[model samples]
Target: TTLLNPYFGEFGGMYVPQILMPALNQLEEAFVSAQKDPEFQAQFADLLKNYAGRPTALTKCQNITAGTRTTLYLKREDLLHGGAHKTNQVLGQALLAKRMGKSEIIAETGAGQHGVASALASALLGLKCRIYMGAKDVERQSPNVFRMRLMGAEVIPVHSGSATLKDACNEALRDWSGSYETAHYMLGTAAGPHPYPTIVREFQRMIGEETKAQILDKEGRLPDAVIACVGGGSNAIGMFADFINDTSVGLIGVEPGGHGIETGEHGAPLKHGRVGIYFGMKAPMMQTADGQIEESYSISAGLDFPSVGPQHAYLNSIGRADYVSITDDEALEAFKTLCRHEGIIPALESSHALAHALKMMREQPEKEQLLVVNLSGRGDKDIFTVHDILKARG
Candidate 1:
């Protein structure tokens, strides 16, 4: 189940311009070699176990489930050292950069979780780090900006196209173009080319592996379904890995519905997008017939991508997993419900999963289904945005 090779299905392929060929080729070569190196594998495992706090716990949210009349489990990835599952891949990339003799690291982030994780990793590994963030995100997620600075990483506020995630990505790519000599581009999700989707998924897949063990240890049986929110689909893929082989366990991917798909301002790429190539890889994407990409809007800054990972596209095509959307109102409701019912303040991103889970249970109350939701990150990074939304309603 390696995420390497031809990208699992028709969802992913290297679709970059000729200028990026050399770097892409270098990455593909190094990644192929690293995959087979026993020493590299050993070190990666040790880091997961000792450094990044592998095996994030799965706690049964009885109170949350009891109120909703559904059995729900929380894969507590928010409890990870950096307060998100992004640390898993960040640490791996930092180690890879160290092994490759890279002296600096660069990355792009939305919601600032990836930037924080990269900064934390760079600080611990004694490397120079730069993070490009959309100007909008810089304002919305200012706390994380301060956190990254405190960790000694330079946070450059990008002011390109939309001054959003795509703009930040473009800025990072531009920086990497001239600086790959001593820099590594640490991507945030399972949506990039060759090595990135593979590497990030492998690192983050520990969430699924841990969930499997924990579910067995605690419940003595497999869960009925694994539900997770998909931004560029890293956390969802990570949570899906453990149950891929188990035909009985259902998989659900929840995407952000900014307002509503009918309103034409959502990030439900799987539901509302077309299949196309973007960001160096082919995947289900939000695009127009003129070959222009569509604008994406989501309450969850993290899940606002116009394209999803190729693996998710594959899963959606093959009917192995179900893809769904949760509207902004539904996500806000779920966010507040989790706080009041379970005392869990989830990231707006994670609320997508919660929203879908609530709907699933409500629609099928007769069936006794157990759901595992990947609580990808804490809500502290999103306090301001959440506050504004709540205040607006009042």
Candidate 2:
């Protein structure tokens, strides 16, 4: 299928050592063939609907959009099984692993949502799963780590680097290099070497596809803008794929503005970083003068990464999408606002998008815009983190 693009303009390549090519080639082949197999897709779609929960509701915010003429709707991936958008594609990747005759899964998680999804899919698909999470993330996202372990997946906490998502991904790549024959690396996001970015978007595009139909049915018109949080950018890519050519609709990705870009502490690579190859793909990455990675900081564990996905970089480069930033403080305000105003406690990662949407509404109060925010996950795992931040602040 032409849907699989190894390169997104100047970005996205198999930028890794020679030893990993065989395994990467095999993965690309399998993913390509599977796309044409009707049986494989039917089963995947069946599970998404019956097990992982597909077609999550398009929920319109009641109080968040009360005074402004700007009406906001949420693509509630937060309500999906495993409580995040990660479940939507994790199932597809696990199914791919099974098809490749791989009996084990090597995965990495940031906020532990991907690990939980990987663990649950392995349970359903009868595969052994081992998830690598950063030491810092494991501590912050304890509930999801427990969920993964309870589902029988081994969770490895990497203490190297900043002990965050970037290091967790490094450890996962290291694991997959040796075990690629018997194990499949279920890279969580739309980043990584060839086929993965394409594969992730293919599976997750159901989010955008569903949103398009749902919104058209509900509003009889496309949204003025579709906004989502961008880390490694799985949810954003999935939500943006179908709408890429719909020039009438605006695509907005809200990157993590930890303290502020001026403080050099945010995770907004697309907005502030240079083009560099990291994490097996040539994408925008934050790096120091000596070319070493600049450790990115974000209050949300999930957005604590230093690079943007290749497709996202390409989109940003071409001006097809607008990449913006939301600070940790702004995200917290949005997190609490949603919970109090709408009874929806959004994940800190997703709170970034909601924060930006609120800003957009306030910016143009008379714009009468229809905005769709991708609420990538719920905040059940983040209440402890939020409580700590709020308590410390108070």
Candidate 3:
């Protein structure tokens, strides 16, 4: 039985070459069957709870929201075992790979958070792993590269195109095209081809699921807004999934605005991009008038992606959610503010969400509101980057 439709209102589809269809079909079949299998569900849930740390805290930001009427809460995905929400789905996908009898895993990563998670998952499950990362990202995200290598995963630097996440993703897809028989391509975010977008979203939706239950327990009602930064939009989609139907709750996705939207140095696809097909799916992307995929820019490595998930496109089209953007300067300010006020150093990507939330709070300081921001990852991986930026300004 097919678990879900491939298209999200004409946005998502299996637009891959003919050779890759069979592998995607197989993955879809396994996922559908696994969903019906109680044992598979139990194992997946057990791993998330015991190993990856499910039910991450919903922290009230008393210090950060001290003067404002707006109440802010952070859904602390950063506290997870692998230091990000990426671990939640990586574990599930790794288990599925094992079930499919695939002995190797191929993945692409941007900020290296997902790469580190993939490496740990492969090591834990005893699967061989190869990670494709942009060479530029590899040099800047050295700590995570070292971490992946320590976990015995081969981190290959893709030097093609812009030498960034998009190029790395292209390389991963090419590798999967040839190695699909013996390897499972564990996509890092909720983007890519049909079955992959659905699979990753379902695996990561626990972020929203938990937030819904926890918010009800804490506030006895839904939050006014749920916020998350959008890269390929895995965390944002995951955090928005359970809240999509709650008409009272607003969903806000923050895109990296780089220098600024006017400067053409941002990654706000939904805000300023056009629809196009890339990396196996049709989605809203930063593309030129001639349809060439333009390079995305963001101080946050994770957010420097040209395209967004198809579901985001669908949501934005229907007006069920609002997509906004934050500049690198704004994100840096938020990062510093959170660290000073609440002692929580957020990943630069997550800081974009926090920045937007703070902006909303300041805009309507007299109006009482509740916002839940998905703190997607810890700032450990970004400390050096932040330091360099601050030092340069000094």
Candidate 4:
């Protein structure tokens, strides 16, 4: 079966030169062959179900939604082994690398969730893994840096550009290009080449599949809408996949409005970004008029990407999904609200979805709407940055 581009819009396609096509082609064929092997499928299934905790609960956010007019649910990907949905993709990719006789993995991270997941997977499978992170993110996500070190993975702090996601991706690409013989470049989001967008989406799409079944079992019907924060669009795709065929269930993607879209300091790539090719994919990206990549700014480290998965762009164009923005303050407020009301501290990335869910609740007060938001990760890794933000404001 031919695979579909994860980012259906102009956002995602392989833009690499002919030199890398051989390796990309090889990997693509291997992935397809592996899928047909029952042993590989069984092993992957076992790891997802038993090791990484597949089908994480669909939690009713009672306290968090108590006062709101709409009913809200949470697809708790935060409960995954590495404390985020990032683990699922990493584990699957790591396994694929091993099957291809690759002994090393190279990756880049923003909030450090992907790095931590890669490190854990490498340690578990006895493979060498190297993670590239921006210097600013290294300082902000100090605990995750230490966690990766403890897991026996090398963490390289990249100091270039804004010292953020874009820079980290550049460093990882350089490393991969130099060491393609034994290393696999494990991209975290669905914004890369053809296989990567499909691969990562397939790995993460289990979230939606599980949620669809759980909601029917619990609520006796489908949710009115599914909302997720789009940082390169992995989590949102995961949460939206199962509902894609269900015309009744609406899909909404929330983008980061660092301050606001008009301020030119946001990472709302689809809404505010223009069409451009970056990191091996042609997609909507935040760019400057001079044809340079614009700096992306977001309060949530994980949601700080300048480009998103191509499939999201297609979804947006076809009107299959709607896009919305959540400001930094709104996300911070939702973060605190979840903490105080439900005693659940959500990652700032996830808070973007929470903020939109609140808006949905207020807008459709008369209807009994069920909104499922993907809780992509936990907040433990973000406390220091959040603390500083709170202190500065105080």
Q: Model 3 over residues 188-254: C-alpha lDDT tens digits? A: 8888888988998889899999999999999999999999999889999999999999999999999
Q: What lDDT, from 0 to 1, does candidate 3 have?
A: 0.92
lDDT of 4 by residue, 2-76 (tens): 343324645666788667666677678778888889998888889999999997988897775665567788888
Q: Model 3 misses residue 275 by how many Å? A: 0.8
TM-score of model 2 relative to the true fold?
0.95
Give the top-scoring candidate (TM-score). Answer: 3
Q: Which pairs of residues collide in candidate 3?
A: none
Candidates' TM-scores? 0.94, 0.95, 0.96, 0.94
Cα lDDT tens digits, model 2, 1-394, are 2235689899999888988888888888898899999999999999999997788999999888887899899999988998999987889989999999999999888767778889999999999999998998788777888889899999999999778776888899888889999999888889888888888999999999999999999999999999999988999999999999999999999999999999999999998998888878898899987888888999997888899789999998899999999999999999999999999999999999999999999998888999999999989888888999889989
Range of the 10 consecutive residues with the lowest summed lDDT in candidate 2: 1-10
Off-target runs (Cα >4 Å) in candidate 2 are: 1-4, 134-142, 157-164
lDDT of 4: 0.86
> Which candidate comes out best when scored by lDDT?
3
Worst 10 residues of 1 by lDDT: 1-10
> What lDDT is obtained when candidate 1 is compared to the true structure?
0.85
lDDT of 2: 0.91
* Residue 236 local lDDT, model 1: 95
Q: In order, what lDDT does every prediction score?
A: 0.85, 0.91, 0.92, 0.86
Query: For all the candidates, what are their Cα RMSDs to the real structure?
Result: 2.3, 2.0, 1.6, 2.1
Q: State residue 386's C-alpha deviation in candidate 4, in Å.
A: 2.2
